[PDB]
């Protein structure tokens, strides 16, 4: 069948896999290439010193464990597979209460290229601290940061 | 335990996906209700709150058991194990069950196959107010 | 009057530490940065520290210099290691909110008088 | 460091690890060190009589069952393993 | 028969790959959507948003779930949505 | 291991224990001695006729 081959490929990839261990653990540093697409810069709340931002947050990284040879190059795989493999635990340093939208389903997409270059993007609403200097109010200006990084893993 | 073996026999081969009498006749669910308190009528959102005990009785021949015990008086554990009607409130803007200390749910299964399922609910239901004659 | 007092040695043959203490205004919420001015060149950004203890460094001096902030005594310190002779210059300390900047001198409103640093071979 | 070796060591560590039992059930008390990094205090509400507090809360404790050998490095595991490991209540 | 329906649905769910869409290597899967708007609650100018309650229904075709011998629509319990693939 | 004795004890305790049934079902009435320690008596809200 045309789908049982993909099922066997997925089973082979997941067999022996341990999502608790990052790629190249103990032998190489994991380079995560990231980018952000801001779908809407939300309102700024002066009272809370807070601003909201809605983003497609994309990450990508190599994972030698998830290389394969198959009929098609990149598997536009279901978002369910994101929980079955290691993913970066990126968190926002100045975020206050961020939302990972999951209507109708968890708004994430995962794609595995044949070499092993995983792409993994998610839809988020992050509200983050934007400290303000109101000396020149209402004629003031601000530079609201948006800062993110790994929570558990060091350089 | 007699009740333990009875429950195991009842759950042997049981599927909660299919309603009872899937292709024989419609399932008749008899609804009852005890309104604890109709909450405040919030005119701004055109809605009112209401707390109820909602009970549904029906028949499931799969749960027929023969024993000297005439009724099993169970708790919320078996609610997810047996089939339950997916009753929902159409005009609800916000509804939720009660989970303290445990889920406020009750199950009773008689030897003739009658299932009674009760639960506590708090419902914020819309009510389109015609305010021409206010107050 | 807002004033930023810089302190540190002037001549070295080596490692050095230069401190910059603020006065008349608390810069705990501001970004504190260091700049370099060689003879006949424009101002070059060296390093910066943010309210969240977050460090930024210039490429020319990445991995060599280290920036730190003491919020209690309201100062920023720069530790210089592995000096090489063309690093001779006057070093400025600045504090401000980074608007259009965090790397441009124009985004800072407070500046120090500058401390000269020279390396002898 | 070998990924297969790390996987087998973690499997051996978590094989038979009873989460219900605290790290030294019959022995003396376990000493838990704690420290905090306060990121910010947001809303000291006089109306609500409370204050918000965002923080990195770090706990430290020694469990004999989770001691391994042959991997001279600190295994920074994925955060989901806490559901399998015992932690203070 | 309820038993025959049971073994039919068990065979349908047996060996079902949720990770793969209905035609993974095939042409795109068509999904027809229709919505029944129950109400619009609060059209807020200050928040620049509106609330909307609806019955939102999707319609697609999965050959893996095709069955036979049952002249009926099997309205299964909603917990099988977890076991079935659905559009994201 | 030294602590495996307690694990075996708990395994023997849970072997065959059906939590769907109350203790003493069909033999005695389950007597529950309950009590409360009020850590903090929360504010009283008059708009909702409620208290925490
Ligand atoms: C795994 O984590 C432990 C605990 O953090 C690391 O142990 C510490 O490693 C450092 C660097 O080798 C040792 O040296 C230094 O100690 C002084 C005095 O405390 C301190 O000022 C330095 O910043 C530095 O930490 C330190 O003594 C040692 N201490 C302990 C408690 O173990 C360990 O190095 C980490 N694993 C690896 C492979 O680095």
CB-CB contact of B14 with E6 (8 Å) = no
Quote the CA–CA distance of A6 and E22 in Å, as a whole number: 12
Q: Any residues with CB less than 8 A from the CB of A28 and at least 6 apart, and which?
A: none
Is B23 within 8 Å of E72 when comparing Cβ atoms? yes
Quote the CA–CA distance of A154 and A86 in Å, as a whole number: 16
Annotate A59-94 with b (16+ C-beta within 10 A) or e (fewer). Answer: bbbbbebbeeeeeeeebebbbebbeebbbbeeebeb
CB-CB contact of B125 with B93 (8 Å) = yes
In ligand 1, which atom is closest to the CA atom of D72?
Answer: 38
In DSSP notation, A38-103 reads EEEEEEEETTTTEEEEEEEEEEEEE-GGG----SSSSEEE-GGGGGGS----EEETTBSS-EE--S
Token pair 């929980």 is at which residue? A83
Name the residue with the closest Cα to ligand 1, atom 6: D74
Token pair 């899967």 is at which residue? E29
Handedness of CA A115, A116, A117, A122 (dihedral sign): positive
Question: 10 Å Cβ neighbour count for C69?
Answer: 20
Question: 10 Å Cβ neighbour count for D32?
Answer: 12
Quote the CA–CA distance of C8 and C37 in Å, as a whole number: 16
Q: How much of chain F is in helix, strand and coil states, percent to nearest 5?
A: 20, 10, 70
Q: Any residues with CB less than 8 A from the CB of E28 and at least 6 apart, and which?
A: none
Taken as a whole, chain B contains a residue count of: 135
Q: Which of D6, D58, D74 to mutate to test the pocket of ligand 1 (most atoms within 8 A of CB)?
A: D74
Backbone phi, then psi, for E47, in 5-degree steps? -85, -15
Q: DSSP secondary-structure letter at D31?
A: P
In DSSP notation, B65-92 reads --SS--EEEE-GGGTTTS-------TTE
Annotate C73-104 with b (16+ C-beta within 10 A) or e (fewer). Answer: ebbbbbebeebeeebbbbbbbbbbbbeebbee
Q: DSSP secondary-structure letter at D81?
A: G
CA-nearest residue to F21 within chain B is: B74
Quote the CA–CA distance of E37 and B75 in Å, as a whole number: 37
Q: Which residues of A touch C102 (CB under 8 A)?
A: 143
CB-CB contact of B78 with F20 (8 Å) = yes
How many contacts (CB atoms, under 8 Å) link B and E?
Answer: 40
Backbone phi, then psi, for C36, in 5-degree steps? -125, 140
Quote the CA–CA distance of D45 and F42 in Å, as a whole number: 16
Quote the CA–CA distance of C68 and C77 in Å, as a whole number: 5
Handedness of CA D4, D5, D11, D14 (dihedral sign): negative
Closest CA to A89 of A22, A29, A145: A22
Q: Any residues with CB less than 8 A from the CB of D47 and at least 6 apart, and which?
A: none
CB-CB contact of A70 with A9 (8 Å) = yes
Question: Containing H/E element for E53?
Answer: strand E49-59
Is D6 within 8 Å of A27 when comparing Cβ atoms? no
Token pair 């049981």 is at which residue? B14
Q: Which residues of D touch A25 (CB under 8 A)?
A: 1, 3, 6
Q: Which residues of D touch A20 (CB under 8 A)?
A: 10, 77-78, 80-81
Considering only CB atoms, which residues of chain F are within 8 Å of chain B? Answer: 18-21, 25-26
Burial bucket for residue B72 (CB in 10 Å: 0-12, 13-18, 19+):
buried
Quote the CA–CA distance of C21 and C28 in Å, as a whole number: 12
Taken as a whole, chain E contains a residue count of: 88
Reported resolution, Å: 3.5
Question: Containing H/E element for C67?
Answer: strand C66-70
Tell me the C-alpha to C-alpha distance, in Å, between residue C118 and each of B42, C38, C89: 76, 10, 7
Pocket around ligand 1 at a 6 A CB cut-off: D 73-74
Quote the CA–CA distance of A23 and A31 in Å, as a whole number: 10
Quote the CA–CA distance of A27 and B50 in Å, as a whole number: 61
Q: DSSP secondary-structure letter at A124?
A: E
Task: Please give the biggest Cα pair distance in chain C.
Answer: 41
Is A27 within 8 Å of D7 when comparing Cβ atoms? no
Q: How was this structure determined?
A: cryo-EM
- E80 close contact with B: CB closer than 8 A: yes
Tell me whether chains B and A touch (3+ CB pairs under 8 A).
no
Q: DSSP secondary-structure letter at A135?
A: G
Quote the CA–CA distance of C31 and C49 in Å, as a whole number: 6
Quote the CA–CA distance of B63 and B15 in Å, as a whole number: 11
Quote the CA–CA distance of A13 and E60 in Å, as a whole number: 29
Reading the block at residue D6, the tokens are 């790390």
CB-CB contact of C34 with C47 (8 Å) = yes
Token pair 């060591």 is at which residue? D9
Quote the CA–CA distance of C62 and C65 in Å, as a whole number: 7
Q: Any residues with CB less than 8 A from the CB of E45 and at least 6 apart, and which?
A: none
């Amino acid at each position: 069948d045309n789908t049982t081959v993909f099922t066997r490929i997925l089973d082979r990839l997941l067999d022996g896999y341990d999502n608790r261990l990052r790629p190249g653990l103990g032998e190489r540093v994991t380079e995560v290439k990231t980018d952000i697409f801001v779908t809407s810069f939300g309102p700024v709340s002066d009272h809370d010193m807070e601003y909201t931002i809605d983003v497609f947050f994309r990450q990508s990284w190599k994972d030698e464990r998830l290389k394969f040879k198959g009929p098609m190059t990149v598997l536009r795989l279901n978002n369910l597979m994101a929980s079955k493999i290691w993913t970066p635990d990126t968190f926002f340093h100045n975020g206050k209460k961020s939302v990972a939208h999951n209507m109708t389903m968890p708004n994430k997409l995962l794609r595995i290229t044949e070499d092993g270059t995983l792409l993994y993007t998610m839809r988020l609403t992050v509200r983050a601290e934007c400290p303000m200097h109101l000396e020149d109010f209402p004629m003031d200006a601000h530079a609201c940061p948006l800062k993110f990084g790994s929570y558990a893993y060091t350089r | 335990g007699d009740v333990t073996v009875i429950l195991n026999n009842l759950l042997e081969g049981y599927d909660n996906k299919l309603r009872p009498d899937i292709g024989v006749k419609p399932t008749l669910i008899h609804t009852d209700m005890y309104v604890n308190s109709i909450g405040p009528v919030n005119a701004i959102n055109m809605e009112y709150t209401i707390d109820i005990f909602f009970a549904q009785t029906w028949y499931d021949r799969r749960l027929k058991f023969n024993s000297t015990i005439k009724v099993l008086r169970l708790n919320s554990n078996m609610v997810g194990k047996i089939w339950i009607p997916d009753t929902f409130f159409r005009n609800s803007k916000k509804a939720d069950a009660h989970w303290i200390t445990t889920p406020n749910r009750m199950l009773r299964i008689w030897n003739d196959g009658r299932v009674l399922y009760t639960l506590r609910l708090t419902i914020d239901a819309e009510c389109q107010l015609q305010l021409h004659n206010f107050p | 009057q807002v004033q930023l007092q810089e302190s540190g040695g002037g001549l070295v043959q080596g490692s050095l530490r230069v401190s910059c203490a603020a006065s008349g205004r608390t810069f705990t919420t501001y970004i504190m940065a260091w700049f370099r001015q060689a003879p006949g060149k424009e101002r070059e950004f060296l390093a910066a520290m943010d309210q969240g203890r977050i460090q930024y460094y210039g490429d020319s001096v990445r991995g060599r210099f280290t920036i730190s902030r003491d919020y209690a005594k309201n100062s920023v310190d720069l530790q210089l290691d592995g000096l090489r002779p063309e690093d001779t210059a006057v070093y400025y300390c600045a504090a401000g909110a980074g608007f259009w900047g965090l790397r441009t001198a124009s985004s800072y409103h407070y500046w120090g008088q500058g401390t000269q640093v020279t390396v002898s071979s | 460091g070998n990924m297969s070796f790390v996987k087998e060591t973690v499997d051996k560590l978590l094989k038979g690890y009873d989460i219900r039992l605290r790290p030294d059930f019959g022995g003396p008390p376990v000493c838990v060190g704690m420290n905090i990094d306060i990121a910010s205090i947001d809303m000291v509400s006089e109306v609500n009589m409370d204050y918000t507090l965002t923080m990195y809360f770090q706990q430290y404790w020694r469990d004999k069952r989770l001691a391994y050998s042959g991997i001279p490095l600190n295994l920074t595991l994925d955060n989901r393993v806490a559901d399998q490991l015992w932690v203070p209540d």
